[PDB]
Write a protein that binds this ligand. Structure first.
Ligand SMILES: *C[C@@H](C)C(=O)n1cc(C=O)c2ccccc21
Ligand SMILES: [Zn+2]
Length: 193
């Protein structure tokens, strides 16, 4: 219900370190033609992160969702009230956050004091040598159809690589549809282009 007075950039940017996302070829499936991830509710979505060169120490990877349509872009993407209130609040993620990271005890959940946007950050640990790729496991905690939240509006996930002093090192993004039938919905949306 909260309206921001800003919207993040969605410009794909590999930067100096060659940062970009990839998806491995069901509970989730990625459409290259649509650049769109289709997934089930609260199921693991593996996203591969790639670099061509090792970023400096202290980098972090941030994930944030925004609505894709301009008339909704200022609305903060969050869980619907029913899913927020019904949450066990047993883990690390605050119950209002749409995007969680699974399997990483160093994740931090952010609520921006000025923009009102939620995001989830994974701080990068010094990587073992020659290590050019890693997997982050994201979870989406509402359906795209949740009438009290996203309410059938498409969203984009924006993944940014940021250095320790906050400079943007890279950006990539993909559309998301969370539904009970990701494989069928991907087929349907792909057959309609
Ligand atoms: C999870 C961290 C912050 C990260 O983004 N990351 C770790 C490693 C380890 O080798 C990466 C390799 C390529 C991109 C991002 C990587
Ligand atoms: Zn919901």
């Amino acid at each position: 219900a909260h309206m921001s007075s800003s919207v993040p950039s969605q410009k794909t940017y590999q930067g100096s370190y060659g940062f970009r996302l990839g998806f491995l070829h069901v509970t989730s499936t990625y459409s290259p033609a649509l650049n769109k991830l289709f997934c089930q509710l609260a199921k693991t979505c593996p996203v591969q992160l790639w670099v061509d060169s090792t970023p400096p120490p202290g980098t972090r990877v941030r994930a944030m969702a925004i609505y894709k349509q301009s008339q909704h872009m200022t609305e903060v993407v969050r869980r619907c009230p029913h899913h927020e209130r019904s949450s066990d609040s047993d883990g690390l993620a605050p119950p209002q956050h749409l995007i969680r990271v699974e399997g990483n005890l160093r994740v931090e959940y952010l609520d921006d004091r000025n923009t009102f946007r939620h995001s989830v950050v994974v701080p990068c640990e010094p990587p073992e040598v020659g290590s050019d790729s890693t997997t982050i496991h994201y979870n989406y905690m509402c359906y795209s159809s949740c009438m009290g939240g996203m309410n059938r509006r498409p969203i984009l996930t924006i993944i940014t690589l940021e250095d320790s002093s906050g400079n943007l090192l890279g950006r990539d993004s993909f559309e998301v549809r969370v539904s009970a039938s990701p494989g069928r919905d991907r087929r349907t949306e792909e057959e309609n282009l």
